[PDB]
Amino acid sequence: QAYLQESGAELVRPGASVKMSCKASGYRFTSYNMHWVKQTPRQGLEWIGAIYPGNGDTSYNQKFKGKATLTVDKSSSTAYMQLSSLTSEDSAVYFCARGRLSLGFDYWGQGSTLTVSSAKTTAPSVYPLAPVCGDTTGSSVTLGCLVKGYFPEPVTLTWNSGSLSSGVHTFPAVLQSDLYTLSSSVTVTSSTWPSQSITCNVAHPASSTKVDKKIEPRGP
Amino acid sequence: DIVMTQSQKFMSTSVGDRVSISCKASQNVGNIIAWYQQKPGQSPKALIYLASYRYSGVPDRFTGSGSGTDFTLTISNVQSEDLAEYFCQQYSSFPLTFGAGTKLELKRADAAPTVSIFPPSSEQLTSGGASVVCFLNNFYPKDINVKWKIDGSERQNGVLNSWTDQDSKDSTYSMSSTLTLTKDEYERHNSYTCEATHKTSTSPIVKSFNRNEC
C-alpha cells in the first residue's frame, strides 16, 4: 500500500537549481524518515541524506552538504529535495525511499532523472556505414548507421522500416562534448546487399525530425 | 565512512543453478545490512534486511547470511527473472553506504567476435569530420579490448566506445568503437586499423583499410 510517486524528468543548464518531489501515500508520512539516493554509472548508489517528516530534522552525507536540501510538506504528505549550483556531475537518477530503523529501505520511488547540460535541442546527423569497398567475406555482410551529435535523448532507429529485425544491434548512446552519438549494426545475407536496398530510418522526437539514409556501396 | 565491497562486478550462472554474491564491510556492522535487486531502468527492490530476513513477497530462493563484516546473498534455483544487479548496504551508521553492485549474467560457450570496420562517409567528410567505426559483434565472454592504429601507430585520443548488454536471444555481447578525427587529420594518413584481443584467440583480430584504395 505504501507508495512513493516522484516527479518527472528534469533537464536544466549548469548553475541552475531543481526542486524534486516525492509524494507519499498508503501510510503515515510523518512516521518514517525519507531518504534520498543518487545513482550514476561511475559512482553507483550514494546516500544523499534523510529527513524525519515529523519535525523536519535532517541528516546529510558530507559529500552532498551544500548541494542538496531536504524539506517536507506534512499536510500534503510530500518530501522535497532541492539541488543547487548544478553541474554535469549532478546528472543522474535520484530516488526517494522510505526508511525503516531496522528494515532498511523497504519502499522506493520510481526515480527522477536529472540532466544538467550546456547543450541545446539538436537533430542528429545520420551517416551511412558501408563496409570498405563494399566487400564482405562470408555469406553475410554487416552495414551500420552512425547517428551523431543529437540532444537530448532518445532517438528511434529501424532498418528498412523495421522489416529487418534479426541481426540488428543498436549500441547505447554515448555523450561527447555535450551531444549524444549512437550507432547501429545490421547483418544480412550477401545476396541481400548491395543487390537490394538497405536503409536506416532515424527519428529524433525532441527536434521533430525523421530521416532515412540509404546504405550505398561505394568505391574511392 | 564505512566501505562496502562487492568484489565481483559480474558473475556468470545458469537457470537452475545456485549463486552466492559476496559483500564485505570495512568495519563491524553486526547484522545491520540489506540487499537490493535492480533491473535496467527500474528502481531498486528490497530483498533482504537484517542480513538474513526476506521482505514480504520475496521468493524463498533468496537467502542472506553473515554477521560482522562478511555477508552473502545466495540465490538458489536461479530463474530468468533473477537476472539483474544486486547491491548490499549497511544502514548501521551515517553516512549510509552501498556496495558497487554485482551483475548476474547467463553463462554460455565462448564466442569469437565478428569484426567490421567502416570508413567515414562522404556525407560526414563534407561537414569537415571523419569518424572511423569498428563493430565487434556477438562475442563471449564480455571482456574485450580494442586498439586503433593509424599508419601503424596506436591512437588513443578521439576514441569513444559503447557496449551492449547481454543479448536476450544468444547471451552474447557486442561493442562499437569510433575514432573521430578532423577531415584534414583523416586525409593526412593512409592506413587505418581496428584490432581486438579476446579470450577466444591468442592473436588479435585485425581489420584494416587504406584511404582511397580498393
Side-chain angles (χ1 to χ4, degrees), chain A residues 39 45 47 59 95 102-105 108-109 127-133 142 148 169 171-172 174 176 183-185 213 218 220, chain B residues 36 38 43-44 46 49-50 55 89 91 94-96 118-119 121 123-124 135 137-138 160-164 174-176 212-214:
Chain A
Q39 180 167 47
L45 296 161
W47 181 71
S59 292
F95 301 98
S102 299
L103 265 58
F105 296 4
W108 294 65
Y127 303 128
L129 294 180
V132 170
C133 306
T142 299
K148 187 175 189 296
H169 279 304
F171 303 83
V174 175
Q176 179 55 291
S183 63
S184 180
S185 160
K213 171 54 72 171
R218 295 172 177 172
Chain B
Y36 304 89
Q38 185 179 48
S43 72
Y49 65 83
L50 291 173
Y55 288 82
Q89 177 211 210
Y91 54 102
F94 293 160
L96 303 186
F118 309 81
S121 63
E123 290 82 351
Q124 181 177 34
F135 291 148
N137 298 335
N138 313 276
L160 235 40
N161 296 148
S162 183
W163 301 263
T164 61
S174 288
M175 156 177 210
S176 184
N212 298 178
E213 282 180 52
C214 285

Short mmCIF file of all heavy atoms in Angstrom, two decimals, chain A residues 39 45 47 59 95 102-105 108-109 127-133 142 148 169 171-172 174 176 183-185 213 218 220, chain B residues 36 38 43-44 46 49-50 55 89 91 94-96 118-119 121 123-124 135 137-138 160-164 174-176 212-214:
data_model
loop_
_atom_site.label_atom_id
_atom_site.label_comp_id
_atom_site.label_asym_id
_atom_site.label_seq_id
_atom_site.Cartn_x
_atom_site.Cartn_y
_atom_site.Cartn_z
N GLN A 39 22.16 7.88 -8.14
CA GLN A 39 22.72 6.74 -8.86
C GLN A 39 23.30 7.17 -10.20
O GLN A 39 22.63 7.82 -11.00
CB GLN A 39 21.67 5.64 -9.09
CG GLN A 39 22.26 4.43 -9.85
CD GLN A 39 21.38 3.20 -9.82
OE1 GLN A 39 20.18 3.27 -10.07
NE2 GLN A 39 21.99 2.05 -9.55
N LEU A 45 25.39 3.78 -6.25
CA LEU A 45 24.38 4.36 -5.37
C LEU A 45 25.06 5.11 -4.22
O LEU A 45 25.92 4.57 -3.53
CB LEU A 45 23.50 3.25 -4.79
CG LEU A 45 22.65 2.45 -5.78
CD1 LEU A 45 22.22 1.13 -5.14
CD2 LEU A 45 21.44 3.29 -6.21
N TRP A 47 24.22 7.60 -0.83
CA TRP A 47 23.24 8.13 0.10
C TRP A 47 23.45 9.65 0.20
O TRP A 47 24.55 10.11 0.51
CB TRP A 47 23.43 7.50 1.47
CG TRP A 47 22.45 7.96 2.49
CD1 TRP A 47 21.12 7.65 2.55
CD2 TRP A 47 22.72 8.80 3.62
NE1 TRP A 47 20.54 8.25 3.66
CE2 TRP A 47 21.51 8.96 4.33
CE3 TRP A 47 23.87 9.44 4.10
CZ2 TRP A 47 21.42 9.72 5.50
CZ3 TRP A 47 23.78 10.20 5.26
CH2 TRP A 47 22.56 10.33 5.94
N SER A 59 19.62 14.96 8.10
CA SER A 59 20.97 14.41 8.23
C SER A 59 21.52 14.30 6.81
O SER A 59 20.83 13.83 5.91
CB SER A 59 20.94 13.03 8.90
OG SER A 59 20.54 13.12 10.26
N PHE A 95 16.56 8.82 -6.37
CA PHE A 95 15.46 8.08 -5.75
C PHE A 95 15.16 8.55 -4.33
O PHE A 95 16.06 8.96 -3.59
CB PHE A 95 15.80 6.58 -5.63
CG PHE A 95 16.08 5.90 -6.94
CD1 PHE A 95 17.39 5.70 -7.37
CD2 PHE A 95 15.03 5.44 -7.73
CE1 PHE A 95 17.65 5.05 -8.57
CE2 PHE A 95 15.28 4.79 -8.93
CZ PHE A 95 16.59 4.59 -9.36
N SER A 102 15.03 -0.68 11.41
CA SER A 102 15.66 -2.00 11.36
C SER A 102 15.44 -2.75 10.06
O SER A 102 16.11 -3.73 9.80
CB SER A 102 15.17 -2.86 12.52
OG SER A 102 15.49 -2.27 13.76
N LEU A 103 14.49 -2.28 9.25
CA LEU A 103 14.18 -2.95 8.00
C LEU A 103 14.76 -2.30 6.73
O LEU A 103 14.41 -2.71 5.63
CB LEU A 103 12.67 -3.11 7.86
CG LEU A 103 12.08 -4.45 8.33
CD1 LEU A 103 12.42 -4.69 9.80
CD2 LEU A 103 10.58 -4.46 8.12
N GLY A 104 15.64 -1.32 6.88
CA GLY A 104 16.24 -0.68 5.71
C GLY A 104 15.30 0.15 4.85
O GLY A 104 14.35 0.74 5.35
N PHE A 105 15.57 0.22 3.55
CA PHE A 105 14.74 1.00 2.63
C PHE A 105 13.71 0.04 2.01
O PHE A 105 13.96 -0.53 0.95
CB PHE A 105 15.60 1.62 1.53
CG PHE A 105 16.62 2.64 2.02
CD1 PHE A 105 16.79 2.91 3.38
CD2 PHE A 105 17.40 3.34 1.10
CE1 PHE A 105 17.72 3.86 3.82
CE2 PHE A 105 18.34 4.30 1.53
CZ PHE A 105 18.50 4.55 2.90
N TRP A 108 10.72 2.21 -2.43
CA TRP A 108 11.47 3.20 -3.20
C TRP A 108 10.58 3.92 -4.20
O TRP A 108 9.56 3.38 -4.65
CB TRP A 108 12.60 2.53 -3.99
CG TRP A 108 13.70 1.92 -3.17
CD1 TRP A 108 13.60 0.85 -2.32
CD2 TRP A 108 15.07 2.31 -3.17
NE1 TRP A 108 14.83 0.56 -1.79
CE2 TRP A 108 15.75 1.43 -2.29
CE3 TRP A 108 15.80 3.31 -3.82
CZ2 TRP A 108 17.12 1.54 -2.05
CZ3 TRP A 108 17.16 3.41 -3.58
CH2 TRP A 108 17.81 2.53 -2.70
N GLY A 109 10.97 5.14 -4.56
CA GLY A 109 10.23 5.88 -5.56
C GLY A 109 10.69 5.34 -6.90
O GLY A 109 11.65 4.54 -6.94
N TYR A 127 24.79 9.33 -40.65
CA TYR A 127 25.79 8.90 -41.61
C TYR A 127 25.75 7.41 -41.90
O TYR A 127 25.65 6.59 -40.98
CB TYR A 127 27.18 9.29 -41.12
CG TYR A 127 27.36 10.77 -40.85
CD1 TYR A 127 27.86 11.22 -39.63
CD2 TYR A 127 27.07 11.72 -41.83
CE1 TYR A 127 28.06 12.59 -39.38
CE2 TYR A 127 27.27 13.09 -41.60
CZ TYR A 127 27.77 13.51 -40.37
OH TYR A 127 27.99 14.85 -40.13
N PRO A 128 25.86 7.03 -43.18
CA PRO A 128 25.84 5.62 -43.56
C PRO A 128 27.18 4.95 -43.28
O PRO A 128 28.24 5.56 -43.45
CB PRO A 128 25.54 5.64 -45.07
CG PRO A 128 25.65 7.12 -45.49
CD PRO A 128 26.20 7.89 -44.33
N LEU A 129 27.12 3.70 -42.85
CA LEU A 129 28.32 2.93 -42.57
C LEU A 129 28.30 1.76 -43.55
O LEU A 129 27.61 0.76 -43.33
CB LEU A 129 28.31 2.43 -41.12
CG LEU A 129 28.41 3.50 -40.02
CD1 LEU A 129 28.39 2.83 -38.65
CD2 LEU A 129 29.71 4.30 -40.19
N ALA A 130 29.03 1.90 -44.65
CA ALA A 130 29.09 0.85 -45.65
C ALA A 130 30.46 0.21 -45.56
O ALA A 130 31.47 0.91 -45.49
CB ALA A 130 28.87 1.43 -47.05
N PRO A 131 30.52 -1.13 -45.56
CA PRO A 131 31.84 -1.74 -45.46
C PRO A 131 32.80 -1.19 -46.51
O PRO A 131 32.39 -0.78 -47.60
CB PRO A 131 31.55 -3.23 -45.66
CG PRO A 131 30.29 -3.25 -46.46
CD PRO A 131 29.49 -2.14 -45.83
N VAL A 132 34.07 -1.14 -46.14
CA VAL A 132 35.10 -0.63 -47.04
C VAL A 132 35.03 -1.37 -48.37
O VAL A 132 34.99 -2.61 -48.40
CB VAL A 132 36.50 -0.82 -46.43
CG1 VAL A 132 37.57 -0.51 -47.47
CG2 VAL A 132 36.64 0.08 -45.21
N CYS A 133 35.00 -0.60 -49.46
CA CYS A 133 34.94 -1.14 -50.81
C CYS A 133 33.72 -2.04 -51.05
O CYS A 133 33.68 -2.79 -52.03
CB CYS A 133 36.23 -1.91 -51.12
SG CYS A 133 37.72 -0.90 -50.83
N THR A 142 27.84 -6.93 -43.02
CA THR A 142 27.34 -6.07 -41.95
C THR A 142 27.42 -4.62 -42.40
O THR A 142 28.42 -4.17 -42.97
CB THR A 142 28.15 -6.25 -40.64
OG1 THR A 142 28.05 -7.61 -40.20
CG2 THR A 142 27.61 -5.34 -39.54
N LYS A 148 25.09 10.79 -35.18
CA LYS A 148 25.99 11.68 -34.47
C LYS A 148 25.56 13.11 -34.15
O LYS A 148 25.03 13.84 -35.01
CB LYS A 148 27.31 11.71 -35.24
CG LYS A 148 28.45 12.46 -34.58
CD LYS A 148 29.72 12.30 -35.41
CE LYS A 148 30.94 12.84 -34.67
NZ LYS A 148 30.86 14.30 -34.44
N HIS A 169 21.83 -4.77 -34.04
CA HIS A 169 22.40 -4.40 -32.75
C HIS A 169 22.47 -2.88 -32.71
O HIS A 169 23.13 -2.27 -33.54
CB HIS A 169 23.84 -4.93 -32.61
CG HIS A 169 23.93 -6.37 -32.22
ND1 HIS A 169 23.32 -6.88 -31.09
CD2 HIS A 169 24.58 -7.41 -32.79
CE1 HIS A 169 23.59 -8.16 -30.98
NE2 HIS A 169 24.36 -8.51 -32.00
N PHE A 171 23.71 0.15 -30.44
CA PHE A 171 24.52 0.43 -29.26
C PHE A 171 24.05 1.62 -28.43
O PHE A 171 23.51 2.59 -28.96
CB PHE A 171 25.98 0.64 -29.69
CG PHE A 171 26.56 -0.52 -30.44
CD1 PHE A 171 26.35 -0.66 -31.81
CD2 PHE A 171 27.28 -1.51 -29.77
CE1 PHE A 171 26.84 -1.78 -32.50
CE2 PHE A 171 27.77 -2.62 -30.45
CZ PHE A 171 27.55 -2.76 -31.82
N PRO A 172 24.24 1.54 -27.10
CA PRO A 172 23.83 2.63 -26.20
C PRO A 172 24.46 3.95 -26.60
O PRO A 172 25.64 4.00 -26.99
CB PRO A 172 24.31 2.15 -24.83
CG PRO A 172 24.16 0.66 -24.93
CD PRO A 172 24.71 0.38 -26.32
N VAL A 174 26.29 7.46 -26.44
CA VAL A 174 27.41 7.90 -25.63
C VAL A 174 27.48 9.42 -25.73
O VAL A 174 27.30 9.99 -26.81
CB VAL A 174 28.73 7.29 -26.15
CG1 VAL A 174 29.91 7.86 -25.37
CG2 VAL A 174 28.68 5.78 -26.00
N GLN A 176 29.25 13.04 -25.76
CA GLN A 176 30.51 13.55 -26.28
C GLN A 176 30.39 15.04 -26.54
O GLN A 176 29.66 15.47 -27.44
CB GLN A 176 30.88 12.82 -27.58
CG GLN A 176 32.18 13.30 -28.23
CD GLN A 176 33.37 13.24 -27.28
OE1 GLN A 176 33.46 14.01 -26.32
NE2 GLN A 176 34.30 12.33 -27.55
N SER A 183 25.25 4.32 -32.60
CA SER A 183 25.45 3.59 -33.85
C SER A 183 24.61 2.32 -33.82
O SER A 183 24.25 1.82 -32.75
CB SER A 183 26.93 3.26 -34.06
OG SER A 183 27.43 2.40 -33.05
N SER A 184 24.29 1.80 -35.00
CA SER A 184 23.51 0.58 -35.09
C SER A 184 24.08 -0.31 -36.18
O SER A 184 24.48 0.16 -37.24
CB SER A 184 22.05 0.89 -35.41
OG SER A 184 21.30 -0.31 -35.50
N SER A 185 24.11 -1.60 -35.89
CA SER A 185 24.63 -2.58 -36.81
C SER A 185 23.52 -3.49 -37.33
O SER A 185 22.58 -3.81 -36.61
CB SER A 185 25.68 -3.43 -36.08
OG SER A 185 25.90 -4.65 -36.72
N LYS A 213 18.32 7.06 -44.39
CA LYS A 213 19.61 7.08 -45.05
C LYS A 213 19.91 5.73 -45.69
O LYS A 213 20.05 4.72 -45.00
CB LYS A 213 20.71 7.47 -44.05
CG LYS A 213 22.13 7.30 -44.59
CD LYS A 213 22.36 8.04 -45.90
CE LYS A 213 22.41 9.55 -45.71
NZ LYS A 213 22.85 10.21 -46.98
N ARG A 218 30.20 1.82 -52.24
CA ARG A 218 30.98 2.87 -52.88
C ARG A 218 32.42 2.48 -53.14
O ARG A 218 32.95 1.53 -52.55
CB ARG A 218 30.93 4.14 -52.01
CG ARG A 218 29.54 4.76 -51.91
CD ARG A 218 29.48 5.90 -50.89
NE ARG A 218 28.15 6.51 -50.86
CZ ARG A 218 27.76 7.42 -49.96
NH1 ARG A 218 28.60 7.83 -49.01
NH2 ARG A 218 26.53 7.92 -50.02
N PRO A 220 36.52 4.30 -54.10
CA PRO A 220 37.22 5.54 -53.75
C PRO A 220 36.77 6.77 -54.54
O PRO A 220 35.96 6.61 -55.48
CB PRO A 220 38.69 5.17 -53.98
CG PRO A 220 38.63 4.08 -55.02
CD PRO A 220 37.46 3.26 -54.55
N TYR B 36 19.51 -5.30 -2.09
CA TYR B 36 18.52 -4.81 -3.03
C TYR B 36 18.78 -5.37 -4.42
O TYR B 36 19.92 -5.64 -4.78
CB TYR B 36 18.54 -3.28 -3.11
CG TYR B 36 18.35 -2.61 -1.78
CD1 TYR B 36 19.44 -2.33 -0.96
CD2 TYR B 36 17.07 -2.31 -1.31
CE1 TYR B 36 19.25 -1.77 0.31
CE2 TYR B 36 16.88 -1.76 -0.04
CZ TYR B 36 17.98 -1.49 0.76
OH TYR B 36 17.80 -0.98 2.02
N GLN B 38 18.06 -4.78 -8.62
CA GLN B 38 17.67 -3.76 -9.58
C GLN B 38 17.79 -4.20 -11.03
O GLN B 38 18.80 -4.76 -11.43
CB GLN B 38 18.48 -2.48 -9.36
CG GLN B 38 18.05 -1.32 -10.25
CD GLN B 38 18.86 -0.06 -10.02
OE1 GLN B 38 20.09 -0.09 -9.98
NE2 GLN B 38 18.16 1.07 -9.89
N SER B 43 13.79 1.06 -10.30
CA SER B 43 14.36 1.42 -9.01
C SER B 43 14.75 0.14 -8.28
O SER B 43 14.32 -0.94 -8.65
CB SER B 43 13.35 2.19 -8.16
OG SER B 43 12.32 1.33 -7.69
N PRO B 44 15.60 0.25 -7.25
CA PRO B 44 15.99 -0.95 -6.51
C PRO B 44 14.77 -1.55 -5.83
O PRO B 44 13.76 -0.87 -5.63
CB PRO B 44 17.01 -0.41 -5.50
CG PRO B 44 17.61 0.75 -6.22
CD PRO B 44 16.42 1.41 -6.86
N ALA B 46 13.76 -4.01 -2.42
CA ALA B 46 14.24 -4.61 -1.19
C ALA B 46 14.09 -6.13 -1.20
O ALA B 46 13.00 -6.64 -1.45
CB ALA B 46 13.49 -4.01 -0.01
N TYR B 49 16.82 -7.96 4.65
CA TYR B 49 17.10 -6.97 5.70
C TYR B 49 17.69 -7.70 6.92
O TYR B 49 17.55 -8.92 7.05
CB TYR B 49 15.85 -6.15 6.07
CG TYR B 49 14.72 -6.92 6.70
CD1 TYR B 49 14.72 -7.21 8.06
CD2 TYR B 49 13.64 -7.36 5.93
CE1 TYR B 49 13.67 -7.91 8.65
CE2 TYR B 49 12.58 -8.07 6.50
CZ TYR B 49 12.60 -8.34 7.86
OH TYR B 49 11.57 -9.04 8.44
N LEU B 50 18.34 -6.95 7.80
CA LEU B 50 18.99 -7.53 8.98
C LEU B 50 19.81 -8.76 8.59
O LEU B 50 19.77 -9.79 9.27
CB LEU B 50 17.96 -7.89 10.05
CG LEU B 50 17.32 -6.65 10.71
CD1 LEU B 50 16.20 -7.08 11.64
CD2 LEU B 50 18.39 -5.86 11.46
N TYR B 55 12.07 -9.80 2.79
CA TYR B 55 10.93 -8.90 2.88
C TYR B 55 9.71 -9.70 2.44
O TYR B 55 9.85 -10.76 1.84
CB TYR B 55 11.09 -7.69 1.96
CG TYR B 55 12.12 -6.67 2.42
CD1 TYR B 55 13.47 -6.86 2.15
CD2 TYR B 55 11.73 -5.52 3.11
CE1 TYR B 55 14.42 -5.92 2.56
CE2 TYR B 55 12.67 -4.58 3.52
CZ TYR B 55 14.01 -4.78 3.24
OH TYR B 55 14.95 -3.83 3.60
N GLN B 89 24.00 -3.04 1.39
CA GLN B 89 24.02 -1.73 2.04
C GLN B 89 24.08 -1.87 3.55
O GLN B 89 23.40 -2.73 4.11
CB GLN B 89 22.74 -0.96 1.70
CG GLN B 89 22.62 0.42 2.38
CD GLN B 89 21.18 0.84 2.67
OE1 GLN B 89 20.85 2.03 2.68
NE2 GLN B 89 20.31 -0.14 2.93
N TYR B 91 23.14 -0.07 6.99
CA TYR B 91 22.33 1.05 7.43
C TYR B 91 22.49 1.15 8.94
O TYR B 91 21.59 1.53 9.68
CB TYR B 91 20.86 0.90 6.98
CG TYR B 91 20.16 -0.39 7.35
CD1 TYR B 91 19.27 -0.45 8.42
CD2 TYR B 91 20.38 -1.56 6.61
CE1 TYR B 91 18.61 -1.64 8.75
CE2 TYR B 91 19.73 -2.75 6.93
CZ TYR B 91 18.85 -2.78 8.00
OH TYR B 91 18.22 -3.96 8.33
N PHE B 94 25.54 6.60 9.79
CA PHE B 94 25.73 7.61 8.75
C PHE B 94 27.21 7.86 8.48
O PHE B 94 28.03 7.85 9.41
CB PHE B 94 25.06 8.92 9.18
CG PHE B 94 23.55 8.86 9.26
CD1 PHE B 94 22.84 9.79 10.02
CD2 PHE B 94 22.84 7.90 8.54
CE1 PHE B 94 21.45 9.78 10.06
CE2 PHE B 94 21.44 7.88 8.57
CZ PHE B 94 20.74 8.82 9.33
N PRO B 95 27.59 8.08 7.21
CA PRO B 95 26.64 8.08 6.09
C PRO B 95 26.34 6.64 5.69
O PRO B 95 27.22 5.79 5.72
CB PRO B 95 27.40 8.84 5.00
CG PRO B 95 28.82 8.43 5.25
CD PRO B 95 28.92 8.53 6.78
N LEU B 96 25.08 6.37 5.35
CA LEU B 96 24.71 5.03 4.92
C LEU B 96 25.48 4.82 3.62
O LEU B 96 25.60 5.75 2.82
CB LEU B 96 23.21 4.94 4.66
CG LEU B 96 22.31 5.33 5.83
CD1 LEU B 96 20.86 5.04 5.46
CD2 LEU B 96 22.70 4.55 7.08
N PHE B 118 34.50 0.45 -40.79
CA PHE B 118 33.89 1.34 -41.77
C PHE B 118 34.60 2.68 -41.84
O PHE B 118 34.99 3.25 -40.82
CB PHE B 118 32.42 1.57 -41.43
CG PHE B 118 31.65 0.30 -41.20
CD1 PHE B 118 31.71 -0.36 -39.98
CD2 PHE B 118 30.85 -0.23 -42.21
CE1 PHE B 118 30.98 -1.53 -39.75
CE2 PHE B 118 30.12 -1.41 -42.01
CZ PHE B 118 30.18 -2.06 -40.77
N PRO B 119 34.76 3.21 -43.05
CA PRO B 119 35.43 4.50 -43.23
C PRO B 119 34.44 5.63 -43.05
O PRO B 119 33.23 5.42 -43.09
CB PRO B 119 35.93 4.41 -44.66
CG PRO B 119 34.74 3.75 -45.34
CD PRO B 119 34.37 2.64 -44.36
N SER B 121 31.98 8.52 -43.89
CA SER B 121 31.16 8.70 -45.07
C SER B 121 31.44 10.01 -45.81
O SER B 121 31.95 10.97 -45.24
CB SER B 121 29.69 8.66 -44.66
OG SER B 121 29.41 9.74 -43.79
N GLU B 123 29.33 12.01 -46.72
CA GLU B 123 28.47 12.98 -46.05
C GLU B 123 29.19 13.67 -44.89
O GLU B 123 29.23 14.90 -44.81
CB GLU B 123 27.20 12.29 -45.54
CG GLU B 123 26.21 11.82 -46.62
CD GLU B 123 26.58 10.48 -47.25
OE1 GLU B 123 27.69 9.95 -46.99
OE2 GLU B 123 25.76 9.94 -48.01
N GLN B 124 29.78 12.88 -44.00
CA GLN B 124 30.49 13.47 -42.86
C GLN B 124 31.75 14.25 -43.27
O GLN B 124 32.04 15.31 -42.72
CB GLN B 124 30.87 12.38 -41.85
CG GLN B 124 31.60 12.93 -40.61
CD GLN B 124 31.89 11.85 -39.58
OE1 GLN B 124 32.15 10.70 -39.93
NE2 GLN B 124 31.88 12.23 -38.31
N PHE B 135 32.88 -2.41 -35.50
CA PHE B 135 31.88 -3.19 -34.77
C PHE B 135 32.52 -4.53 -34.41
O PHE B 135 33.13 -5.17 -35.26
CB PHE B 135 30.63 -3.48 -35.61
CG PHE B 135 29.78 -2.28 -35.92
CD1 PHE B 135 29.07 -2.22 -37.12
CD2 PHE B 135 29.63 -1.25 -35.00
CE1 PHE B 135 28.22 -1.15 -37.39
CE2 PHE B 135 28.77 -0.18 -35.27
CZ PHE B 135 28.07 -0.13 -36.47
N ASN B 137 30.98 -7.72 -33.03
CA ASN B 137 29.70 -8.33 -32.69
C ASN B 137 29.62 -9.79 -32.24
O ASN B 137 30.40 -10.65 -32.66
CB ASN B 137 28.72 -8.14 -33.85
CG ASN B 137 28.41 -6.67 -34.14
OD1 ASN B 137 28.53 -5.81 -33.26
ND2 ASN B 137 27.99 -6.38 -35.37
N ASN B 138 28.64 -10.03 -31.37
CA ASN B 138 28.31 -11.35 -30.84
C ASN B 138 29.45 -12.19 -30.30
O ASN B 138 29.70 -13.30 -30.79
CB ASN B 138 27.56 -12.12 -31.92
CG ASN B 138 26.45 -11.30 -32.57
OD1 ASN B 138 25.33 -11.22 -32.05
ND2 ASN B 138 26.77 -10.66 -33.68
N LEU B 160 35.82 6.70 -28.79
CA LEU B 160 34.63 6.59 -27.95
C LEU B 160 34.06 5.19 -28.13
O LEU B 160 33.84 4.74 -29.26
CB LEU B 160 33.61 7.65 -28.35
CG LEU B 160 33.09 8.59 -27.26
CD1 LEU B 160 34.22 9.01 -26.33
CD2 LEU B 160 32.45 9.80 -27.93
N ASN B 161 33.80 4.50 -27.02
CA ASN B 161 33.28 3.14 -27.07
C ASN B 161 31.87 2.98 -26.50
O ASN B 161 31.44 3.76 -25.64
CB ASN B 161 34.21 2.19 -26.30
CG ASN B 161 35.59 2.09 -26.93
OD1 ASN B 161 36.59 1.90 -26.23
ND2 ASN B 161 35.65 2.21 -28.24
N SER B 162 31.17 1.96 -26.97
CA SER B 162 29.83 1.64 -26.50
C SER B 162 29.64 0.12 -26.48
O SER B 162 29.97 -0.56 -27.45
CB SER B 162 28.78 2.28 -27.40
OG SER B 162 27.48 2.03 -26.89
N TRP B 163 29.11 -0.39 -25.37
CA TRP B 163 28.89 -1.82 -25.19
C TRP B 163 27.41 -2.14 -24.98
O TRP B 163 26.70 -1.40 -24.30
CB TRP B 163 29.67 -2.31 -23.96
CG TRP B 163 31.15 -2.08 -24.02
CD1 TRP B 163 32.11 -2.98 -24.40
CD2 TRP B 163 31.84 -0.87 -23.69
NE1 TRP B 163 33.35 -2.40 -24.33
CE2 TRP B 163 33.22 -1.11 -23.89
CE3 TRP B 163 31.43 0.40 -23.24
CZ2 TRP B 163 34.20 -0.13 -23.66
CZ3 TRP B 163 32.40 1.37 -23.01
CH2 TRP B 163 33.77 1.10 -23.22
N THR B 164 26.94 -3.23 -25.57
CA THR B 164 25.55 -3.60 -25.38
C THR B 164 25.49 -4.50 -24.15
O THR B 164 26.53 -4.94 -23.65
CB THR B 164 24.99 -4.42 -26.55
OG1 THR B 164 25.75 -5.63 -26.69
CG2 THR B 164 25.05 -3.61 -27.85
N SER B 174 28.14 -7.33 -27.67
CA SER B 174 28.64 -6.63 -28.85
C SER B 174 29.21 -5.29 -28.41
O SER B 174 28.88 -4.77 -27.34
CB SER B 174 27.52 -6.42 -29.88
OG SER B 174 27.17 -7.65 -30.50
N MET B 175 30.10 -4.75 -29.24
CA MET B 175 30.76 -3.49 -28.95
C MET B 175 30.97 -2.67 -30.20
O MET B 175 31.13 -3.21 -31.30
CB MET B 175 32.10 -3.77 -28.26
CG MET B 175 33.13 -2.66 -28.40
SD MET B 175 34.65 -3.04 -27.48
CE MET B 175 35.19 -1.37 -27.05
N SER B 176 30.96 -1.36 -30.02
CA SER B 176 31.18 -0.44 -31.11
C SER B 176 32.29 0.50 -30.67
O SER B 176 32.28 0.98 -29.53
CB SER B 176 29.91 0.36 -31.40
OG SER B 176 30.08 1.19 -32.53
N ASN B 212 41.22 5.74 -49.87
CA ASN B 212 41.15 5.79 -51.33
C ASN B 212 41.78 4.61 -52.06
O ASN B 212 42.33 4.78 -53.15
CB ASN B 212 41.79 7.08 -51.85
CG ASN B 212 41.08 8.32 -51.35
OD1 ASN B 212 41.49 9.44 -51.65
ND2 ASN B 212 40.00 8.13 -50.60
N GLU B 213 41.70 3.42 -51.48
CA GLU B 213 42.26 2.23 -52.12
C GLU B 213 41.39 0.99 -51.94
O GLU B 213 41.05 0.61 -50.82
CB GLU B 213 43.67 1.93 -51.59
CG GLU B 213 44.76 2.82 -52.17
CD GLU B 213 46.13 2.49 -51.60
OE1 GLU B 213 46.53 1.31 -51.64
OE2 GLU B 213 46.82 3.43 -51.12
N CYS B 214 41.02 0.38 -53.06
CA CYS B 214 40.20 -0.83 -53.07
C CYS B 214 40.86 -1.89 -53.93
O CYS B 214 41.78 -1.53 -54.69
CB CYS B 214 38.79 -0.52 -53.60
SG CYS B 214 37.75 0.38 -52.41
#
